[PDB]
């Protein structure tokens, strides 16, 4: 079917085909557009005309120009070949390292698993960063929201995360850099390269990269999100895996959805937000889960719109979030890397019913205590110390030890840390914190517990600092 | 859905969407000229007051506008179905629009696909041919009494300002 | 003309709904019968919504809209260095005809990832504070933000002025071709500005694209992109450009205004959504590039003038989401006499150290930090008193440091000086000294090392950094100098 | 102190050349434009060429 | 059109005519003068009333010393 | 050409011009009209229909009535014979001193002088009203924007300024009463009459009045700016004059633009504020300048809508200005008179050397001290009307004094104030404060500085207290 530009009002290209108008979503290719001009059918406007959105930037066009419908929505490469590769939205190597050899294509829309496929009870995704895992015990398939101070080695952590699990547990990762600064993706790129997590000698760099930076149509950038999803879906179902879907920023996506709406002539609801803000969310989020085949654990970087989150969308988002990563610059400032906000980075799933009751207690006890210490700082702040009980002192120290024990050296950033990172088998972790809590070391320096890996190794570091 | 006939002229919507219907109607059966002509005839047969602007009162309603203009195709003798589309302009008030709808329709035969010249041109008249401004060359290069109050005087203008426009 | 032309379908509001030209390109700038240009933004069903860049008294309907058949391109070259042009790039300087007889399509891709290369470069502005705390880089973007007459422009100007030495700074990627985008800037203001520039004749390495409010809105809108094109050019000519977009606030206004006139959805906060994209694409076009490509730069200084706290305002928010940091300027502080104005605390350079000189790192690292600490406790008390000595020092010092980040208007500085003087304070030297006389010192000292220790300054400059030895000298110099400054 | 005096003399001769140039231009162009079309063949001589457009553009 | 150079002729003629009849404002009549006279004065103001057919020279002295 | 009123929807008269249209901004005269119904062509809607704007009232109109296009915008009288002649916007008198008669006519639109025409420097206009000089030292030729409470002391000030300067000033002045309430212009007039500056034996008075009040229909109000400009442009250039230009209130103009937009088939921009707004600005503000053949030295009253400046309009406005005097209603509320916002009695013709530093600094110190006084207020908020560290107390006091020293009698409002305005020519002014700053006076008491001119007189007043 060929259609004719009947109207270009921006990237709303209204196309009249006197030829079939297939279903909506269909990617149309403009004939006469020497760089891939995807139009995604947005409306069948009526009377042989469809409303499309160019997913690209427009120019040169004449009203009438011939467009040939790709007869399906946008189909994109799916497959391993993306790992260690940067694709744009259209999939095209913005690795700029020639093409990527895929065969498996997928239309970027996909759906929420149908109900019966629901692996009914999610199960902790093990972060293995002790603290992280502890306070936010993620769920395999889970949506983790990342509130956070940028570039702290935000990315380092992420990189590290990918490393920690997705290596460890052989999962996979997707980073869909949505709307990002090309620069930041660039930075990251090399950073991965640099990290070796991106390997250029291996396209089994534990991450497939898709970037849809702030220069594409909002929808297009937005749709880079779907793309990433589509790929990750490949790895879950097809590769049977726990795919990690690292997303930056789901917000920017959000904004983008809304952005088209207006222009879509819609009435996009609150904050200007798409009325379908929710549906957009729902359908994508609902695509995310744990299938029986695996997990798409979605780690979603979360930009703080209006430095607020009650901005209806994030507010909604919370419904989807289940584990929260609040990164704490304060913890970082204490030199503690992990720099996480402990007592706010949480996971709902955290239960004793669920995620071990012991774990749980230990955690709650911990959280409680951590808070309690937290209280005590305040007290002590003003009250010096040893104006108070030594039980407080003990705990303070313990808390602190625990604190330090949360500090986990880092594995590629021997350059920053002067240490090598380490990963922590869960049980010993639970045990670990309990033990410190149990104060079974009370003659060892706490600075030992700083940048410790697993609790034994913490004991080990304890020893060395204990001379 | 249907065959969609987009013959040159074509109003590109704008209420010869009927015309575009009828370009496919006309084209079907090729009652092109007949109807083209029907329309001319009709054209003022309507467009005069004569029962017609009276009937173009609002105040007469399609209670029986449906029964007297329509039954002006009946009142007339046209309507090989050309009234029926009237009865549509009838609701769709397009009756007052029709000449133009006809224009778009017509222009006339191969005339359907005219053209009048401009830029430096003085000249008025359509183009029915294939390649052109052979004819236009030979159209100017016809008479030579000619106007420039029928278009361009390149004279005041084209370059009359230009030297000025440099300074 | 068989057809190479169209008739103005409708006109009102300088928005020419255009009959014909369908053949038309997309985003063709067209030519009206009045010699005026317009731009065919919307080739919509039956007309072309064409923005009129002139006035519609001039125009009339059915008017021949002649294709130009052209999407705007801009004249390109660097003969605009030494020129003030309008948005297309036509003399407005009144210097007679321009020199940029190369042309370049404005439509230019933002550099790819591989084309990009991160920063490792500083770039200086001479603004003590700035270069210190948000150490200046190239190829970047940075929001300069602050209220009306923050010397807003002044701030920028002194930076431009600062580049003089850099164009005298024969490292070529330390020679900077300066691009000044004036958005909605009265000719009078501009006249002044220019006037400064003239005086400074930085203008020789400088394009001044000047879009005063008079300019039709798309023109004003367009201009930055234009400017942008020109800088990408330099970038691609391994040349290092500085574009100051001053100010997108006005641009946005215009753009919306435009939209609306186009009866087109604008968006959030009444402003178009893809005005973000607009800018995004604009700013994506600024970069620090792989060297292989000449790896020039286009360093971007966007300006937004706050109306205060309305950063929340969509476009600032936008920009925030875009930016590489923001320069919050604190007017209050200015009023306090604290000039630089800066709300430092909110000012940020996300990047930081790659744009920093090790030199600067050496003196600054501690300071940034010190100021941080200082600042919260700076904020504390002052209740006609303060309390413990430790902190009291920090304050004293701090206060000094505050002067150190200060600088009068019309006073851009060289890094070595800057580092130098900072070094003094850092090294806990003038914290003894009392505030008016700091200022006094600073001068005295500065002209002093310049005078005497130009040698040393030479060294530091040379090493590109303080050396412990340079330090050792410096310190020595300083200590005596200081001693002399006092006693 | 010398230079400024020189620039005045040059600048005046420039300014006067333009101030004559426009007035001379308007006076000339308003004089001879009034003729011309009496020779309609300033019209024909281009219909000639305009025909060498109507032919030799396509 | 076709006349390219025959038009330029029409313009050319008057340029010589005026030059070969120079006097006042040249067929302009007093009207050019009235503006001119003000303009010439104004430019003097920008350089002050320093004569431009003279060559300046002066001597210059000394002050307190140490 | 001729039109028929085809549609009247408010003062938007959409006229279908029967004949072909004439350019936009062609001023139309409705034929047979009651009197002069000028319509300004706004859009060629097509259909040989224009959307026009009646400037005037649309009472009594056949929706067919014939209109004859004047084929251009207005021709309006411009010529010296206007000063002290109050014209309506439409050129025509409202002086009622019979007809004004000028020989030179104009389209009320006019151009915005070029970059190249820019006269590249302006030098301080001073008023000797301390506060002004100090805080917003004007530039001769400047666009001064009086952000300011409604017509408050605005009006007063303006008048007074006019007095001080426009008198002193040998060049002309123009008052364009935009959206004014007639009464004040009546008054205004009377002052001038009274003063004789409206000479009634000079219709080339030192001041020309154009009044374009709210009572007009929009177009008129809308257009009065262009008009005023045109006259003034005449006055400026031709006689080379420094015109002093009052526009009060450009806001009310702005308001007028904003009022129309919808009706002009447009939508406005935000909050109703016209979609064209900037260009509208550009074109007006840029229409004014201070030529190379004089100055349109402008004091333009700017109502600060709702005293909110966040407000896009003022936000824009600022750009065009040279010195902004934002009067602080709070200060006014402190009873203070001059009632200014000093910190926002400002000048872009201020920055360290654009006023120079004495003043600047003195001010910075001053600004500092008041601000600091604000800061200290916070302390006081806990601690009291006489409590703090003493030094602080000095400075506070200095601020309170300074504040008072800034208060000045008013000649105009000597009626209200009971004391006639003062002039402190600048040196004595800067000095004045400098002394106080010097703490010279410290022994002195603050309210002795309240409502003073020269600083000595305040000292004198202290004696007068006791």
Is position F97 annotated as part of the catalytic site?
no
- Indicate whether E55 belongs to any domain: no
Those chains having 3 or more beta-carbon pairs within 8 angstroms of chain C are A, B, F
Q: F38 and F28 in contact (C-beta within 8 Å)?
A: yes
Chain D contact present for E58, CB below 8 A: no
* Interchain pair D45, E11: CB under 8 A: no
Chain A residues touching residue C23 (CB < 8 angstroms): 62
d(Cα C413, Cα C178) in Å, to the nearest integer? 17
Contacts of C387 (CB under 8 A, 6+ apart): C381
Q: A134 and A287 in contact (C-beta within 8 Å)?
A: no
Element (H, E) at C112: none
Q: F209 and F86 in contact (C-beta within 8 Å)?
A: yes
d(Cα A114, Cα A283) in Å, to the nearest integer? 12
| Nearest C-alpha neighbor of A59 from the set A127, A11, A1, A112 | A11
Choosing from C104, C196, C350, C427, the catalytic residue is: C350
CA geometry: angle C267, C272, C278, nearest 5 deg: 145
HEC readout, C409-449: CCCCCCHHHHHHHHHHHHCCCCCCCCHHHHHHHHHHHHHHH
- Pairing, β F77-78 against β F104-105: antiparallel
Q: State which residue of chain C sits closest to A185, comparing Cα positions.
A: C113
Note whether A336 and A358 are same-domain residues. no
Chain A contact present for C43, CB below 8 A: yes
Q: For residue D4, give how far its alpha carbon lies from the nearest alpha carbon of chain E (Å).
A: 7
Instruction: Report residue A346 as tokens.
Output: 């949480």
Listed as own residue / partner, the contacts of E24-31 with beta carbons closer than 8 Å and 24 or more positions apart are E25/D23, E26/D20, E26/D24, E27/D27, E28/D23, E28/D24, E28/D27
Instruction: Report residue F185 as tokens.
Output: 């212009």
Q: Is A226 helix (H, G, I), strand (E, B) or coil?
A: helix
* Interchain pair B167, D21: CB under 8 A: yes
Q: For residue F181, give how far its alpha carbon lies from the nearest alpha carbon of chain C (Å).
A: 31
Choosing from A66, A154, A348, A431, the catalytic residue is: A154
d(Cα C166, Cα C186) in Å, to the nearest integer? 29
Find the CATH number of the domain harbouring A392: 1.10.1140.10
Those chains having 3 or more beta-carbon pairs within 8 angstroms of chain F are C
d(Cα F160, Cα F138) in Å, to the nearest integer? 15
- Technique employed here was cryo-EM
Reported CATH class of domain C1-70: mainly beta
Note whether A148 and A199 are same-domain residues. yes
Note whether A166 and A215 are same-domain residues. yes
Chain C residues touching residue A58 (CB < 8 angstroms): 26-27
Chain E contact present for B158, CB below 8 A: yes
DSSP A412-465: STHHHHSS------HHHHHHHHHHHHTT--TTS-GGGTTT--SHHHHHHHHHHH
- Indicate whether E58 belongs to any domain: no
Chosen from A57, A67, A86, A214 to mutate, greatest number of chain C CBs within 10 A: A214
Q: A153 and A364 in contact (C-beta within 8 Å)?
A: no
Q: For residue D9, give how far its alpha carbon lies from the nearest alpha carbon of chain B (Å).
A: 23
Rg (CA), chain B: 21
DSSP β-bridge partners for residue A299: A144, A246
Name the CATH architecture for the domain at C71-356. 3-Layer(aba) Sandwich (3.40)
For A139, phi and psi rounded to 5 degrees? Answer: -115, 140
Q: For residue B98, give how far its alpha carbon lies from the nearest alpha carbon of chain E (Å).
A: 40
Place of tokens 């940091």: C325
Domain range spanning residue A24?
1-73
Ordered by start, the domain boundaries in chain C are 1-70, 71-356, 357-487
Note whether F206 and F229 are same-domain residues. yes
The beta-carbon neighbor of B12 closest among C3, C4, C45 is C45
d(Cα F393, Cα F390) in Å, to the nearest integer? 4
Q: How many CB atoms lie within 10 A of CB E29?
A: 10
* Interchain pair D50, B154: CB under 8 A: yes
The beta-carbon neighbor of B120 closest among C1, C45, C46 is C1
Chain B contact present for C94, CB below 8 A: no
- Indicate whether E60 belongs to any domain: no
Choosing from F29, F75, F92, F181, the catalytic residue is: F181
Note whether A41 and A98 are same-domain residues. no
The separation between the first and the last C-alpha atoms of chain D, rounded to the nearest angstrom, is 64
Q: Do chains B and E touch (3 or more CB pairs under 8 A)?
A: yes
* Interchain pair D55, B137: CB under 8 A: yes
Choosing from F4, F154, F223, F401, the catalytic residue is: F154
Note whether F95 and F180 are same-domain residues. yes
Q: How many CB atoms lie within 10 A of CB F444?
A: 18
Which residues does B contribute to its contact with D (CB < 8 Å)?
120-121, 131, 133-134, 136-137, 140-141, 144, 148, 153-156, 160, 163-164, 167
Q: C235 and C173 in contact (C-beta within 8 Å)?
A: no
d(Cα F421, Cα F162) in Å, to the nearest integer? 13
Q: For residue B35, give how far its alpha carbon lies from the nearest alpha carbon of chain A (Å).
A: 24
DSSP β-bridge partners for residue A124: A139
Rounded (10°) CA dihedral C314, C319, C325, C327: -70
Is position F287 annotated as part of the catalytic site?
no
Find the CATH number of the domain harbouring A164: 3.40.50.300
Q: Do chains B and F touch (3 or more CB pairs under 8 A)?
A: no
| Nearest C-alpha neighbor of A362 from the set A303, A433, A423 | A433
Those chains having 3 or more beta-carbon pairs within 8 angstroms of chain B are A, C, D, E
Note whether A167 and A257 are same-domain residues. yes
Q: Which fold has domain C357-487?
A: 1.20.150
Chosen from B11, B116, B119 to mutate, greatest number of chain C CBs within 10 A: B119
Q: For residue A90, give how far its alpha carbon lies from the nearest alpha carbon of chain C (Å).
A: 15
C457 Cα distance to chain centroid? 29
Q: C64 and C7 in contact (C-beta within 8 Å)?
A: yes
Chain C residues touching residue B121 (CB < 8 angstroms): 1
Chain B contact present for D25, CB below 8 A: yes
Find the CATH number of the domain harbouring F2: 2.40.10.170
Domain termination site, one of F73, F104, F137: F73
- CB-based burial label for C228 (10 Å; 0-12, 13-18, 19+): buried
Q: Is A287 helix (H, G, I), strand (E, B) or coil?
A: coil
Q: C368 and C132 in contact (C-beta within 8 Å)?
A: yes
Chain C residues touching residue F275 (CB < 8 angstroms): 256-257, 260-261
* Interchain pair D36, E50: CB under 8 A: no
HEC readout, chain F: CEEEEEEEECCEEEEEECCCCCCCCCEEEECCCCCCCEEEEEEEEECCEEEEEECCCCCCCCCCCEEEEEEECCCCEECHHHECEEECCCCCECCCCCCCCCCEECCCCCCCCCHHHCCCCCCEECCCCHHHHHHCCEECCCEEEEEECCCCCHHHHHHHHHHHHHHHCCCCEEEEEECCCHHHHHHHHHHHHHHCCCCCCCCCCCEEEEEECCCCCHHHHHHHHHHHHHHHHHHHHCCCCEEEEEEECHHHHHHHHHHHCCCCCCCCCHHHCCCCHHHHHHHHHCCCCCCCCCEEEEEEEEECHHHCCCCHHHHHHHHHCCEEEECCHHHHHCCCCCCCCCCCEEECCCCCCCCCHHHHHHHHHHHHHHHHHHHHHHHHHHHCCCCCCHHHHHHHHHHHHHHHHHCCCCCCCHHHHCCCCCCCCHHHHHHHHHHHHCCCCCCCCHHHCCCCCCHHHHHHHHHHHC
The beta-carbon neighbor of B14 closest among C4, C35, C46 is C46
* Interchain pair B155, D29: CB under 8 A: no
* Interchain pair A218, C277: CB under 8 A: yes
Chain F contact present for C331, CB below 8 A: no
- Indicate whether E35 belongs to any domain: yes
- Pairing, β C348-349 against β C325-328: antiparallel
Q: In what order do the strands lie in the sheet with C143-146?
A: C83-85, C206-211, C177-183, C240-246, C297-305, C143-146, C325-328, C348-349
Note whether A59 and A117 are same-domain residues. no
Q: How many domains, in total, are found in chain F? A: 3
Choosing from A180, A233, A239, A446, the catalytic residue is: A180
F181 is annotated as contributing to ligand binding = yes
Note whether F156 and F301 are same-domain residues. yes
Note whether F236 and F329 are same-domain residues. yes
Is position F181 annotated as part of the catalytic site?
yes
Note whether F46 and F155 are same-domain residues. no
d(Cα B16, Cα B10) in Å, to the nearest integer? 7
Q: How many domains, in total, are found in chain E? A: 1
- CB-based burial label for C483 (10 Å; 0-12, 13-18, 19+): exposed
Domain termination site, one of A349, A366, A394: A349
CA geometry: angle F178, F182, F186, nearest 5 deg: 115
Note whether A389 and A448 are same-domain residues. yes
- Indicate whether E24 belongs to any domain: yes
- CB-based burial label for F168 (10 Å; 0-12, 13-18, 19+): exposed
Contacts of A151 (CB under 8 A, 6+ apart): C350
* Interchain pair D24, E43: CB under 8 A: no
d(Cα A298, Cα A232) in Å, to the nearest integer? 10
Find the CATH number of the domain harbouring E11: 6.10.280.200
Listed as own residue / partner, the contacts of C454-459 with beta carbons closer than 8 Å and 24 or more positions apart are C457/C416, C457/C417, C457/C420
């Amino acid at each position: 079917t060929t259609g004719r530009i009947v109207a270009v009002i921006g990237a709303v290209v209204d196309v009249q085909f006197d030829e079939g108008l297939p279903p909506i979503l269909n990617a149309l290719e403009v004939q006469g557009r020497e760089t891939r001009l995807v139009l995604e059918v947005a409306q069948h406007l009526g009377e042989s005309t469809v409303r499309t959105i160019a997913m690209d930037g427009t120019e040169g066009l004449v009203r009438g120009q011939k467009v040939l419908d790709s007869g399906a929505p946008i189909r994109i490469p799916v497959g391993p070949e993306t790992l260690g590769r940067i694709m744009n939205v259209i999939g095209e190597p913005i690795d700029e390292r020639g093409p990527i050899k895929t065969k498996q294509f997928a239309a970027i829309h996909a759906e929420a698993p149908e109900f019966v496929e629901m692996s009914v009870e999610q199960e902790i995704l093990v972060t293995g960063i002790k603290v992280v895992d502890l306070l936010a015990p993620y769920a395999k398939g889970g949506k983790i929201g990342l509130f956070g101070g940028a570039g702290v080695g935000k990315t380092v952590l992420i990189m590290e995360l990918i490393n920690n699990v997705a290596k460890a547990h052989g999962g996979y990762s997707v980073f869909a850099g949505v709307g990002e600064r090309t620069r930041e993706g660039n930075d990251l790129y090399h950073e991965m390269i640099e990290s070796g997590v991106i390997n250029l000698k291996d396209a089994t760099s534990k991450v497939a990269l898709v970037y849809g930076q702030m220069n594409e149509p909002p929808g297009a950038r937005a749709r880079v999100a779907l793309t990433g999803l589509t790929v990750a879906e490949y790895f879950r179902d097809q590769e049977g895996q726990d795919v990690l879907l690292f997303i930056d920023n789901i917000f920017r996506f959000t904004q983008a959805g809304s952005e088209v709406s207006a222009l879509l002539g819609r009435i996009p609801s609150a904050v200007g937000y798409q009325p379908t803000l929710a549906t957009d969310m729902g359908t994508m989020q609902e695509r995310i889960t744990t299938t029986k085949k695996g997990s798409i654990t979605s780690v979603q970087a979360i930009y703080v719109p209006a430095d607020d989150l009650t901005d209806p969308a994030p507010a909604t988002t919370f419904a989807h979030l289940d584990a929260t990563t609040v990164l704490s610059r304060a913890i970082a400032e204490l030199g503690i890397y992990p720099a996480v906000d402990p007592l706010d980075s949480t996971s709902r799933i955290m239960d004793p019913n669920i995620v071990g009751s012991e774990h749980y207690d230990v955690a709650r006890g911990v959280q409680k205590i951590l808070q309690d210490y937290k209280s005590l700082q305040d007290i002590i702040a003003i009250l010096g110390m040893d104006e108070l009980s030594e039980e407080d002192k003990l705990t303070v120290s313990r808390a602190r030890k625990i604190q330090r024990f949360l500090s986990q050296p880092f594995q590629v950033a021997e350059v920053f840390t002067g240490h090598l990172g380490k990963l922590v088998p869960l049980k010993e972790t639970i045990k670990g914190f309990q033990q410190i809590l149990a104060g079974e070391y009370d003659h060892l320096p706490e600075q030992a517990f700083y940048m410790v890996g697993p609790i034994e190794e913490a004991v080990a570091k304890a020893d060395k600092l204990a001379e | 859905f249907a065959k969609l006939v987009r013959p040159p002229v074509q109003i590109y919507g704008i209420e010869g969407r009927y015309a575009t219907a009828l370009y496919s109607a006309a084209s079907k059966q090729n009652k092109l000229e007949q109807v083209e002509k029907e329309l001319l005839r009709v054209g003022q047969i309507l467009k005069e007051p004569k029962m017609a602007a009276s009937l173009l009162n609002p105040y007469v309603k399609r209670s029986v506008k449906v029964k007297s203009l329509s039954d002006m195709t009946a009142k007339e003798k046209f309507s090989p179905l050309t009234s029926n589309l009237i009865n549509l302009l009838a609701e769709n008030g397009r009756l007052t629009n029709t000449p133009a709808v006809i224009s778009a329709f017509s222009t006339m035969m191969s005339v359907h696909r005219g053209e009048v010249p401009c830029t430096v041109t003085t000249a008025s008249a359509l183009d029915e041919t294939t390649l052109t401004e052979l004819k236009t060359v030979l159209k100017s290069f016809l008479s030579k009494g000619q106007v420039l109050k029928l278009e361009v005087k390149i004279d005041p203008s084209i370059m009359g300002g230009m030297i000025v426009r440099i300074g | 003309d068989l057809e190479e032309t169209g008739r103005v379908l409708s006109i009102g509001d300088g928005i020419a709904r255009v009959h014909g030209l369908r053949n038309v390109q997309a985003e063709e700038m067209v030519e009206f019968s009045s010699g005026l240009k317009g731009m065919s933004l919307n080739l919509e069903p039956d007309n072309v919504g064409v923005v009129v860049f002139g006035n519609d008294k001039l125009i009339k309907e059915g008017d021949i809209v002649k294709r130009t058949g052209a999407i705007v391109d801009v004249p390109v070259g660097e003969e605009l260095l030494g020129r003030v042009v309008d948005a297309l790039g036509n003399a407005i300087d009144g210097k007679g005809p321009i020199g940029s007889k190369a042309r370049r399509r404005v439509g230019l891709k933002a550099p790819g990832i591989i084309p990009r290369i991160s920063v490792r470069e500083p770039m200086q502005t001479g603004i003590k504070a700035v270069d210190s705390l948000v150490p200046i880089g190239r190829g970047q973007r940075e929001l300069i933000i602050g209220d009306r007459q923050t010397g807003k422009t002044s701030i920028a100007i002194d930076t431009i002025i600062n580049q003089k030495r850099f164009n005298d700074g024969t490292d070529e990627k330390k020679k900077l071709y300066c691009i000044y985008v004036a958005i909605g800037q009265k000719r009078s203001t501009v006249a002044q500005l220019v006037k400064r520039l003239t005086d400074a004749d930085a203008m020789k390495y400088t394009i001044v694209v000047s879009a005063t409010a008079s300019d039709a809105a798309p023109l004003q809108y367009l201009a930055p992109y234009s400017g942008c094109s020109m800088g990408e050019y330099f970038r691609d000519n391994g040349k290092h450009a500085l574009i100051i977009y001053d100010d997108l606030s006005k641009q946005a206004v215009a753009y919306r205004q435009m939209s609306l006139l186009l009866r087109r959805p604008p968006g959030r906060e009444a402003y178009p959504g893809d005005v973000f994209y607009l800018h995004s694409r604009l700013l994506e076009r600024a970069a620090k590039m792989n060297d292989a490509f000449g790896g020039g730069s286009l360093t971007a200084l966007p300006v937004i003038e706050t109306q205060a706290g309305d950063v929340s305002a969509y476009i600032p928010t936008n920009v925030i989401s875009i930016t590489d940091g923001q320069i919050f300027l604190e007017t209050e502080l200015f009023y306090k006499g604290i000039r630089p104005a800066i709300n430092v605390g909110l000012s940020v350079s996300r990047v930081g150290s790659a744009a920093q000189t090790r030199a600067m790192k050496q003196v600054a690292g501690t300071m940034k930090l010190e100021l941080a600490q200082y600042r919260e406790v700076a904020a504390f008390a002052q209740f006609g008193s303060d309390l413990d000595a430790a902190t009291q020092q920090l304050l004293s010092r701090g206060v000094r440091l505050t002067e150190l980040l200060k600088q009068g208007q019309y006073s851009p500085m060289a890094i070595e000086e800057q580092v130098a003087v900072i070094y003094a304070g850092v090294r806990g030297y003038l914290d003894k000294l009392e505030p008016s006389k700091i200022t006094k010192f600073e001068n005295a000292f500065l002209s002093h090392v310049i005078s005497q220790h130009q040698a040393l300054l030479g060294k530091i400059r040379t090493d590109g950094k303080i050396s412990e030895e340079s330090d050792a000298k410096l310190k020595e110099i300083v200590t005596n100098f200081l001693a002399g400054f006092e006693a | 102190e010398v230079k400024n005096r020189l620039d005045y003399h040059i600048s005046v001769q420039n300014m006067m050349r333009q101030k004559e140039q426009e007035h001379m231009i308007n006076w000339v162009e308003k004089r001879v434009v009034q003729s011309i079309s009496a020779q309609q063949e300033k019209e024909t001589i281009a219909k000639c060429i305009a025909d060498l457009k109507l032919l030799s553009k396509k | 059109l076709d006349p390219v150079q025959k038009l330029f002729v029409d313009k050319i003629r008057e340029y010589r005519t005026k030059r070969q009849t120079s006097g006042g404002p040249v067929d302009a009549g007093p009207e050019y003068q009235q503006d001119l006279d003000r303009e010439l004065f104004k430019l003097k103001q920008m350089y002050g009333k320093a004569d431009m057919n003279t060559f300046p020279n002066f001597t210059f002295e000394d002050p307190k010393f140490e």
